[PDB]
Amino acid sequence: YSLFPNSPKWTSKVVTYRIVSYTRDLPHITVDRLVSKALNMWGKEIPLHFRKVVWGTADIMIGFARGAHGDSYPFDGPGNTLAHAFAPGTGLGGDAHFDEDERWTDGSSLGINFLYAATHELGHSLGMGHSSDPNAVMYPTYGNGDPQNFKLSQDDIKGIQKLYGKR
């Protein structure tokens, strides 16, 4: 595993998040469930707790967008970059954006598995960098293992716990 330079991390006991926009590919209820699932995958290993808010600012702002969307990291259409997240910090820090030009799926269809993509992106939102281990969720490319049957690897757990300590 690798953390970000200067290992930024959330210092609060609870970190909020808010889904600002949704994808046309899934029901809104599924995205909400999958984001909670993804945050819990990491939360289970550490002292943090998460709370969803539906208005204003949240530490982790989540949204779907196609093309240019304000932050100077335009999406590129179907394929290639699927999504991108930023290291913990104020403003854009900690946010996670998903390329709406992708065909998002809960796993029952062809497309990009949103639970897997959200686990990777929220890993970045928490301060995780990329792993060299092809089996890790934090590996840079999609598809090595099985998007429909996966869990954090020992490498991902070692990294998140180094950053925030064990629960």
Ligand X SMILES: CC(C)C[C@H](CS(C)(=N)=N)C(=O)N[C@H]1Cc2cn(c3ccccc23)CCCCCCNC1=O
Nearer to Zn ion, 18 or 97 (CB): 97
Identity of the residue numbered 143: G
Nearer to ligand X, 10 or 139 (CB): 139
Output the CA–CA distances (angstroms, integers) from residue 10 to 4, 93, 121, 161, in the order listed: 13, 10, 15, 13
Task: Tell me how far apart the alpha carbons of residues 17 and 53 are, in angstroms, rounded to a whole number.
Answer: 6
Q: Is residue 99 part of an annotated ligand binding site?
A: yes
The residue count for binding Zn ion (CB under 5 A) is 3
Number of H helices, E strands in the chain: 3, 7
Angle between helices 114-126 and 154-164 (to 10 degrees): 30
| Residue 76 touches Zn ion, criterion: CB under 5 A | no
Neighbours of 92 (CB within 10 A): 15
Decide: helix, strand or coil at residue 88: coil
Q: Is residue 28 part of an annotated ligand binding site?
A: no
Q: Is 45 a catalytic residue?
A: no
| Residue 95 touches Ca ion, criterion: CB under 5 A | yes
Answer for which of 25, 45, 99, 121 binds Ca ion (CB under 5 A) is 99
Nearer to ligand X, 67 or 79 (CB): 79
Q: Is residue 97 part of an annotated ligand binding site?
A: yes
In the range 65-94, which residues lie near Ca ion by CB under 5 A?
A: 76, 80-81, 94
Output the CA–CA distances (angstroms, integers) from residue 131 to 3, 72, 83, 147, in the order listed: 9, 25, 17, 17
Residues 10, 121, 137, 153: which is the catalytic one? 121
| Position of minimal CB gap to Zn ion | 97
Residues that bind Zn ion (CB under 5 A): 71, 73, 97
Residues that bind Ca ion (CB under 5 A): 76, 80-81, 94-95, 99
- Which residues are catalytically annotated? 121
